[PDB]
Amino acid sequence: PNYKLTYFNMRGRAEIIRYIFAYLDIQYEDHRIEQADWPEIKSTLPFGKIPILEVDGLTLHQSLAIARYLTENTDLAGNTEMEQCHVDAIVDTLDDFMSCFPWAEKKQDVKEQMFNELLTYNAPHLMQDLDTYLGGREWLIGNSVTWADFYWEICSTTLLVFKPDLLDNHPRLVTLRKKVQAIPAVANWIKRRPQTKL
Amino acid sequence: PNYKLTYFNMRGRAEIIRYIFAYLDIQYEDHRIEQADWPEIKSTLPFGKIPILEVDGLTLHQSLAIARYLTENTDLAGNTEMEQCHVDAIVDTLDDFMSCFPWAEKKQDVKEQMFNELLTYNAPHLMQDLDTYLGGREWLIGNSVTWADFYWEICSTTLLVFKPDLLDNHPRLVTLRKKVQAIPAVANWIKRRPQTKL
Ligand SMILES: COCCCNC(=O)c1nc(-c2cccc3[nH]ccc23)no1
Ligand SMILES: COCCCNC(=O)c1nc(-c2cccc3[nH]ccc23)no1
Ligand SMILES: N[C@@H](CCC(=O)N[C@@H](CS)C(=O)NCC(=O)O)C(=O)O
Ligand SMILES: N[C@@H](CCC(=O)N[C@@H](CS)C(=O)NCC(=O)O)C(=O)O
Numbered sequence: 001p002n003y004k005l006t007y008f009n010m011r012g013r014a015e016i017i018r019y020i021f022a023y024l025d026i027q028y029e030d031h032r033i034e035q036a037d038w039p040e041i042k043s044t045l046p047f048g049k050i051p052i053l054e055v056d057g058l059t060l061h062q063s064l065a066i067a068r069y070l071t072e073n074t075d076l077a078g079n080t081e082m083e084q085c086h087v088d089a090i091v092d093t094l095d096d097f098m099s100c101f102p103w104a105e106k107k108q109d110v111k112e113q114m115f116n117e118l119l120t121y122n123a124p125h126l127m128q129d130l131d132t133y134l135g136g137r138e139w140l141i142g143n144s145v146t147w148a149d150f151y152w153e154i155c156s157t158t159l160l161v162f163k164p165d166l167l168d169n170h171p172r173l174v175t176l177r178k179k180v181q182a183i184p185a186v187a188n189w190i191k192r193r194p195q196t197k198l
Numbered sequence: 199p200n201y202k203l204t205y206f207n208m209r210g211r212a213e214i215i216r217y218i219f220a221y222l223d224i225q226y227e228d229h230r231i232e233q234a235d236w237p238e239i240k241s242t243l244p245f246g247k248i249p250i251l252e253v254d255g256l257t258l259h260q261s262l263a264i265a266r267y268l269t270e271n272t273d274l275a276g277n278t279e280m281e282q283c284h285v286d287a288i289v290d291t292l293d294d295f296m297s298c299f300p301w302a303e304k305k306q307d308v309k310e311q312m313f314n315e316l317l318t319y320n321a322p323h324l325m326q327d328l329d330t331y332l333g334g335r336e337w338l339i340g341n342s343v344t345w346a347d348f349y350w351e352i353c354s355t356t357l358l359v360f361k362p363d364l365l366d367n368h369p370r371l372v373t374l375r376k377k378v379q380a381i382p383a384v385a386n387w388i389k390r391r392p393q394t395k396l
């Protein structure tokens with residue numbers, strides 16, 4: 001099975017897919033494009049959005065649909081049917097927040113204002129909600145790591161770029177981040193991946 | 199199982215779950231709230247959003263996470279892992295767009311202008327994409343109805359309230375809506391359900 005992942009040269013929405021490839025030890029082409037190459041790719045796509053993942057000549061889309069597909073019937077999926085639901089819910093909650101950010105906003109002052117508002121007013125409540133949900137458990141869902149723990153680490157890493165103090169009052173969330181970063185395949189990918197701001 | 203769904207008295211984000219319950223002939227309590235009991239209830243919710251689904255003492259959240267869980271091991275979900283990925287992707291593409299609308303905006307002129315903007319530029323672009331993706335095939339994914347077909351009928355039913363002419367040059371998408379509506383269990387539900395604008 002031949003894999004080609006296309007995205008911008010950044011972690012962004014594609015990183016969850018990259019973590020999953022790493023963990024499952026699957027080789028793939030990590031295709032990263034410039035903004036100036038985007039329009040000619042975009043015009044050929046069914047839905048005009050990245051990331052996309054090509055598998056044996058079939059173009060998949062939607063970052064989380066792809067991540068869910070790649071983890072189905074692996075240990076990164078929930079351990080029960082209910083656990084898979086919890087995984088999906090946490091992932092969407094995180095995605096809902098990250099999606100609020102005006103990432104492609106060209107007017108810098110308007111962009112700054114919004115980032116500031118979401119990070120100062122909204123991000124702290126999500127952290128609180130996540131902290132209580134985790135409680136004293138080892139992973140977000142069940143007794144072993146799921147791709148929701150992956151997604152938490154990935155989202156939180158980007159949020160900490162803009163707001164370094166985000167988890168000062170949430171040591172158990174920091175512990176979860178660190179636990180994720182300690183998984184051998186993930187540590188390895190973290191070590192060797194392209195370093196970009198986002 | 200003792201299923202209890204909580205949402206506003208409206209179709210909204212809960213409707214997909216209601217279609218699935220109806221189609222799979224799964225009994226549930228359809229609890230609807232006024233604003234009166236909203237800020238009250240918004241407290242015991244671990245994430246303060248609806249819909250939620252209570253199943254034997256567990257409060258589940260995220261409308262699409264719940265929907266997917268209920269489709270588990272049925273033809274409705276997609277017939278292969280790959281089809282399930284297509285179903286998940288279409289649903290997320292739809293949800294991404296519906297999420298763009300300022301549903302709660304209190305300034306009536308701002309709301310009107312944003313709705314018009316989205317329905318004039320974004321919606322026709324997405325419609326061309328959806329139409330070409332479906333082609334002259336029977337269903338969006340595979341040889342039989344999936345919950346992605348359900349979600350398309352659901353999202354478009356609401357969009358048509360605001361722009362009645364939205365599908366006037368998309369007969370294949372109209373045909374899809376009609377095919378979904380005439381599925382007996384869906385036809386039964388659509389007649390039985392409370393009449394609300396949204
Ligand atoms: C022309 O657009 C360039 C791509 C801009 N996108 C970003 O900068 C970016 N998006 C996300 C993002 C969005 C939604 C969910 C997410 N989860 C993790 C990152 C992320 N992070 O960075
Ligand atoms: C006090 O706040 C209540 C906001 C009222 N909400 C709506 O009218 C609404 N419907 C939808 C909706 C319907 C179908 C699919 C959807 N996907 C995302 C939102 C949505 N979203 O908001
Ligand atoms: N919900 C989708 C969103 C995909 C998306 O909108 N990606 C952005 C980049 S992060 C994009 O394609 N922007 C360029 C464009 O819209 O033309 C997903 O997770 O894949
Ligand atoms: N992505 C979530 C969104 C949940 C959501 O934002 N619910 C809406 C109801 S349409 C809401 O206004 N929640 C209550 C609130 O935020 O006050 C889902 O699909 O379940």
Ligand SMILES: [Mg+2]
Binds near residue numbers: 095
């Ligand atoms: Mg989503």
